[PDB]
Design a protein around this ligand. Structure first.
Ligand code: MG
Ligand code: MG
Ligand code: MG
Ligand code: MG
Ligand code: MG
Ligand code: MG
Ligand code: MG
Ligand code: MG
Ligand code: MG
Ligand code: MG
Ligand code: MG
Ligand code: MG
Ligand code: MG
Ligand code: MG
Ligand code: MG
Ligand code: MG
Ligand code: MG
Ligand code: MG
Ligand code: MG
Ligand code: MG
Ligand code: MG
Ligand code: MG
Ligand code: MG
Ligand code: MG
Ligand code: MG
Ligand code: MG
Ligand code: MG
Ligand code: MG
Ligand code: MG
Ligand code: MG
Ligand code: MG
Ligand code: MG
Ligand code: MG
Ligand code: MG
Ligand code: MG
Ligand code: MG
Ligand code: MG
Ligand code: MG
Ligand code: MG
Ligand code: MG
Ligand code: MG
Ligand code: MG
Ligand code: MG
Ligand code: MG
Ligand code: MG
Ligand code: MG
Ligand code: MG
Ligand code: MG
Ligand code: MG
Ligand code: MG
Ligand code: ZN
Lengths: 68, 157, 105, 208
RNA sequence: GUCUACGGCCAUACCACCCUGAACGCGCCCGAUCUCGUCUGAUCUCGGAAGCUAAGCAGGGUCGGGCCUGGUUAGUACUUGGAUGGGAGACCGCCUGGGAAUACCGGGUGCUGUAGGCU
RNA sequence: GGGGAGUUUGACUGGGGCGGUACACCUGUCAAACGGUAACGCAGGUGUCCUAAGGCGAGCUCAGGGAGGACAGAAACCUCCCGUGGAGCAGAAGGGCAAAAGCUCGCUUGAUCUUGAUUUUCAGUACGAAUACAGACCGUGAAAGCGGGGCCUCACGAUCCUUCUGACCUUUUGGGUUUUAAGCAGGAGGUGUCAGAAAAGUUACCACAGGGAUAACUGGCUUGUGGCGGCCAAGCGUUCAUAGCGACGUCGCUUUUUGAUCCUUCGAUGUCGGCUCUUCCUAUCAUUGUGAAGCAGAAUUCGCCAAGCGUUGGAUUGUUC
RNA sequence: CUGUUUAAUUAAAACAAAGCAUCGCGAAGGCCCGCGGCGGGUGUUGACGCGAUGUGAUUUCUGCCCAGUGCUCUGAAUGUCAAAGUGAAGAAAUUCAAUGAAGCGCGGGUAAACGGCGGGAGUAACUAUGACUCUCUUAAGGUAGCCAAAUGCCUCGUCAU
RNA sequence: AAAUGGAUGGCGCUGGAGCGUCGGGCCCAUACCCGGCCGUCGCCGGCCUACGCCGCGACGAGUAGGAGGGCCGCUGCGGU
RNA sequence: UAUAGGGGCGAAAGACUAAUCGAACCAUCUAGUAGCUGGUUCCCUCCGAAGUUUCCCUCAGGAUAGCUGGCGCUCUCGCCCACGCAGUUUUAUCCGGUAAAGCGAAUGAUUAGAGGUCUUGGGGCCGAAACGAUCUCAACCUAUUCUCAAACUUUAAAUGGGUAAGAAGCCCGGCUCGCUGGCGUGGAGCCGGGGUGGAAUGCGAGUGCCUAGUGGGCCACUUUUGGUAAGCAGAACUGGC
């Protein structure tokens, strides 16, 4: 009882009925697969930022506000 | 039944061009690749360490990871049903920059320069592109020379 | 294949490359009261008859060769198993082959 | 042997004899030049051509029969050693046959019916020359009649044409007698060598 | 107008032959005691500076061979879409668009990135 | 211990069986210049080998050819020259490689540990294979660097059970010690029908549910084969191609043979031959009227309009023949 | 031969038959029935008997093979070998060791037990075919008979009627 | 040259009712345009059963299958 | 009168055993199981397919994905400018090895002629024989010449594949790093104020859950594999039943 083996007929119609839209592009996609050393350095820079940010950046903001 | 394989059917795709065999040129190594730049993929046969799959040949994608001898590229591979954003780790031997992004950057620089320069003069410059418009009415010239008559040649075997 | 009898390899216990001694691995005999043999015996006992199946249709010709690496450092006695690809003929210790030899038959 | 009706058109890709056939019967034709091969280029001025009008296949046996007919007519029309014929078409496409049940339904119907090679044919395109004959200036009607006789033996539909070229060379007949006088064409047996101007000066010093 | 050291493009810059090279530089070249290695100081290594552009090398030339580019081949072979177009078929023509290569001919044959010595 | 009882008799398949594995995995074409794409489509392979044929560093350049040297001869060894891969890289092919991935030399096991993410068939599940990292210990070179197997594309295996390795680990049930057992992680013992049941044959004494998804009848599509014609004309025909044939080639009709496919028929179309009987077809055996011969007559051979009329009696064979 | 056979598609060449052979058994036995008993059939029986097979009037013939598959017999010289029993180690579970009943393996016999019975080369004063001979094989190579048979594909074999 | 008598569809057609190139008219589909009516959807409008009453526009085929409405229908029970 | 159902009986046909015998009849398990046939009941309205991927002792089936429907939910227009999307085009940008073409270019096949001969082999000539000399053929080389390659290729189309055409972007200043490091070097992260009109056309989009049916297809223009061919078997895009 030989039958049909494999065809791709009437497949593009099934695909285009729902759509072949591109994947959802969003900001801050992901951080997976990134170098572990680079990720560790980024975490350290993010967690040590508020130590010196809230003072020197505030002083510079006051200075630029006095400038303009 | 078609003998699916990792390098099936790349006899002419992964081969080096004619009169271009030998060691790799050193200019392709000194190129800088940062995160977020749009690059292209072209499989090279000189090295076989980090070559991509035959389905990503000629594909353009952005870089999301950088390492010592390779780069991570997010490629939009169209599977039968939809498109998947796949992360691929390929060495720098098979990657080159995309001039489309460079042309776009040059165009946006020209635009933000032209507008900044014309704001003072008050001239509303048309920096937005357009399609090729139909040519306007022009005046040809014959300078007294009569147009040459064209006649179809008789058939000859 | 041919393998060396002694090779300095990373030791899991002390965390350092120590000279281990390579020997052949022999599958130990399955002793009784192993919680699988007891269950098998209790299942076979009775009038049922061959509760568990016996494997037929053997296809694999040879097995995978594994080596027992034992660390020679005193008061360490670290033992490990190292597997290699399948092979028909395996030889534990022999002379090294050379080039420009006297292979004349 | 199967008739020529079933091996007329071009239905399959070229299947030449190579390392993948590993078996093929020998062709029917063995010789392509039948006139005087040692003739010079100034011996036979004109030349005819059998140009095919249909894109089909020509069998080597048909080529053999047609060239035998042409030679038999020519050696009687203008005598032996007075012409030069050439079958330009060469057979390389190998047609395969599938012998059917060596007569009973015991054997397989179409299971593994790739078949074995049967013979060799020649693929001809529209406008491709099959045969070409060179003779003297007065044997025009004789060449035309020989090509007409070969037409009745070749299948399909092919016409006759007397080319403006000089013999077998790619040069015209009008620009040949004046270009061979001065050093621009060198006759070498049945062919002519065209000497270009972009060569070393020693080749020009050797002449003149 | 040139070379050396390090390099990008990787024959417009490779191959064979023939001419020129002033002042630096490259090299040829002279010698094995120490560093070093072979049968051999030929090659690789520490000592040079008696001669040389003979060679490499750098330029120029060949109605030179290759390489690049441009005409010819040619709107030709092909090809997207169309017809109730032709033909018995094989195949072909038309409309709307894109458009190849070999013969043949003509032109070129290195340009530059950093440090340095000369006329 | 078939005396008796239970159960099984792989799948694909131009019907089924036999044949073969297209059932697991690769190379080139098929494949229509992204990827993908079938047939019992083509041309081939694999279930291994390597303590080096892995890694590093250095040196050298291969196959072949040209001209010479005592035995030396086509091929022994030495020297010079040409030598862009025409050799070699373990094995089937494709790609790739020249101070190299090829040969030689010296040290070496990175062919060792560990957690993730990613690529490949993909349902984007697993196995296998592979990529780039990261964390410790080492190899190598002076060093930049390379190496966590073979230059790349295949060379291999779930659950349960068994065995081995490690914690100076967890539980062994009212509380302690010990043997033992169970428990965590990773290596092996196999499912080649290779995402993995433990399996012989016959039934013409056969039964059941179904199938025209699937053979043995007919009919239908093509005519390879069979039969029947045409064209060319090398030759036979004492002479002479075509009175009569006509090779080498080539173009057509037929379903009165066989074969190819399985479209209707499986809740049945009663499947060989013979006897009796009707009608039709013409590619005419004879008869009516004709043309041509190598037609003296007679007897013959080749065609034309031509199916109106006939085309028998028996021996053996079920026989068509 | 007489006889019997598929009631309701077969009457036979089938079955049966006397005859011819072979096997087991001397009764605490041979062949069988039986869930059970020293329960039952042969057996109110005893080798001229019982039980199990093959061939199938009379005559003459009963060829050769025990290699294989079956049957049977032998010696604790001899290999494998379960429970149970013995010794040892261990605190014990447990482990090891010594010995080892039938059977299997080894050897002999048996084919009126199942069965089988090949293939090359040189040799006659017309030549061939072939008297005769050499050689591989396994256990032996179709002897006496008979035939295109109810057994022969080629085959509608060849010759005579 | 093929077997029941028979197929440009038939009758028939030859200054065409045949072939090739064409012109002006004409014939009709559930297609197009205009208009009425029914339903769905969207937008809605109003402080007239709000689960009701209106307005505009665009669309309506369909096996297997999935939903919504029924003031369609049969039986029995609690209210009316 | 004795033998009663895996039993009896059988001069053996697997025949007979109450019209049933290659395993009787009666009742129960039992409404045994069936991937297999047949059937499956009222109206209207709306939406509306698949015969395809992978796996299975899988091929008359099932699971998975895909196609479909329902329930929603989150926003956007409606009073010089939109978020976003597209079976499409335009502009830049690479990717490829088909059609075609070539082999007086690599590899493998391939017909014939012309010249030169270093050597090799076969013939004829001078003549004790002799690379002492000569004519010719085969072989080799050179420059041409005819015809081909789905598993050849220098070159190389059309069609076609991916990306980009902005506010998720650019310019400026300052902080953090245990990452790297001559250097306040490089690279990432964060903060702060200033500047939207960025190719054409068309359109409202995004997302969650549940889910039936399907899992035998066929035909056509064109490109194609096996076959002589088939209303034959097997593929790619599109359309149709
Ligand atoms: Mg199917
Ligand atoms: Mg027991
Ligand atoms: Mg020394
Ligand atoms: Mg020394
Ligand atoms: Mg020296
Ligand atoms: Mg010099
Ligand atoms: Mg000089
Ligand atoms: Mg030149
Ligand atoms: Mg077209
Ligand atoms: Mg049984
Ligand atoms: Mg089957
Ligand atoms: Mg394609
Ligand atoms: Mg492709
Ligand atoms: Mg090296
Ligand atoms: Mg290879
Ligand atoms: Mg190669
Ligand atoms: Mg590391
Ligand atoms: Mg499987
Ligand atoms: Mg059975
Ligand atoms: Mg019977
Ligand atoms: Mg059918
Ligand atoms: Mg025929
Ligand atoms: Mg049929
Ligand atoms: Mg009937
Ligand atoms: Mg009937
Ligand atoms: Mg009649
Ligand atoms: Mg009786
Ligand atoms: Mg009867
Ligand atoms: Mg008794
Ligand atoms: Mg008798
Ligand atoms: Mg006997
Ligand atoms: Mg015996
Ligand atoms: Mg005991
Ligand atoms: Mg004799
Ligand atoms: Mg005899
Ligand atoms: Mg007799
Ligand atoms: Mg009529
Ligand atoms: Mg409508
Ligand atoms: Mg509807
Ligand atoms: Mg009512
Ligand atoms: Mg029973
Ligand atoms: Mg009865
Ligand atoms: Mg029963
Ligand atoms: Mg029921
Ligand atoms: Mg299926
Ligand atoms: Mg949906
Ligand atoms: Mg290809
Ligand atoms: Mg081609
Ligand atoms: Mg079919
Ligand atoms: Mg089909
Ligand atoms: Zn250790």
């Amino acid at each position: 009882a030989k039958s049909k083996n494999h065809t791709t007929h009437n497949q593009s119609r099934k695909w285009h009925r729902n759509g072949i839209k591109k994947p959802r592009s969003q900001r801050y996609e992901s951080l997976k697969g990134v170098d572990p050393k680079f990720l560790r350095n980024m975490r350290f820079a993010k967690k040590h930022n508020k130590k010196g940010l809230k003072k020197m950046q505030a002083n510079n903001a006051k200075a630029v506000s006095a400038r303009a | 039944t078609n003998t699916k394989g990792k390098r099936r059917g790349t006899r002419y795709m992964f081969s080096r061009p004619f009169r271009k065999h030998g060691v790799v040129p050193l200019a392709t190594y000194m190129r800088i690749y940062k995160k977020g730049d749009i690059v292209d993929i072209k499989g090279m046969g000189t090295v076989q360490k980090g070559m991509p799959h035959k389905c990503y040949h000629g594909k353009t994608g952005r870089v999301y990871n950088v390492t010592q001898h390779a780069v991570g590229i997010i490629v939009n591979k169209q599977v039968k049903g939809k498109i998947l954003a796949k992360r691929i780790n390929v060495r720098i031997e098979h990657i080159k920059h995309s001039k489309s992004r460079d042309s776009f950057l040059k165009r946006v620089k020209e635009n933000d320069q032209k507008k900044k320069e014309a704001k003072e003069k008050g001239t509303w410059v048309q920096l937005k592109r357009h399609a090729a418009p139909p040519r306007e009415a022009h005046f040809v010239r014959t300078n007294g020379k009569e147009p040459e008559l064209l006649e179809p040649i008789p058939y000859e075997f | 294949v041919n393998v060396p009898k002694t090779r300095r390899t990373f030791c899991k216990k002390c965390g350092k490359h120590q000279p281990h001694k390579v020997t052949q691995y022999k599958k130990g005999k399955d002793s009784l009261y192993a919680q699988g043999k007891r269950r098998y015996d209790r299942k076979q006992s009775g009038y049922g008859g061959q509760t568990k199946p016996i494997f037929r249709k053997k296809a694999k010709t040879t097995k995978k060769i594994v080596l027992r690496l034992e660390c020679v450092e005193p008061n360490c006695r670290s033992k490990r198993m190292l597997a290699i690809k399948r092979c028909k003929h395996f030889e534990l210790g022999g002379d090294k082959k050379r080039k420009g030899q006297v292979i004349q038959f | 042997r199967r008739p020529a009706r079933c091996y007329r058109y071009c239905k399959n890709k070229p299947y030449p004899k190579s390392r993948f056939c590993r078996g093929v019967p020998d062709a029917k034709i063995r010789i392509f030049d039948l006139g005087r091969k040692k003739a010079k280029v100034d011996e036979f001025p004109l030349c005819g051509h059998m140009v095919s009008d249909e894109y089909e296949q020509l069998s080597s046996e048909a080529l053999e029969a047609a060239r035998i007919c042409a030679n038999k007519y020519m050696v009687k029309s203008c005598g032996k050693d007075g012409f030069h014929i050439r079958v330009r078409l060469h057979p390389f496409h190998v047609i395969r046959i599938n012998k059917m049940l060596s007569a009973d339904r015991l054997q397989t119907g179409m299971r593994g019916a790739f078949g074995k090679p049967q013979g060799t044919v020649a693929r001809v395109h529209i406008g491709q020359v099959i045969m070409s004959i060179r003779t003297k200036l007065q044997n025009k009607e004789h060449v035309i009649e020989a090509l007409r006789r070969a037409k009745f033996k070749f299948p399909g539909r092919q016409k006759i044409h007397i080319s403006k070229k000089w013999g077998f060379t790619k040069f015209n007949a009008d620009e040949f007698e004046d270009m061979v006088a001065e050093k621009r064409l060198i006759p070498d047996g049945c062919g002519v060598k065209y000497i270009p101007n972009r060569g070393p000066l020693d080749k020009w010093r050797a002449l003149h």
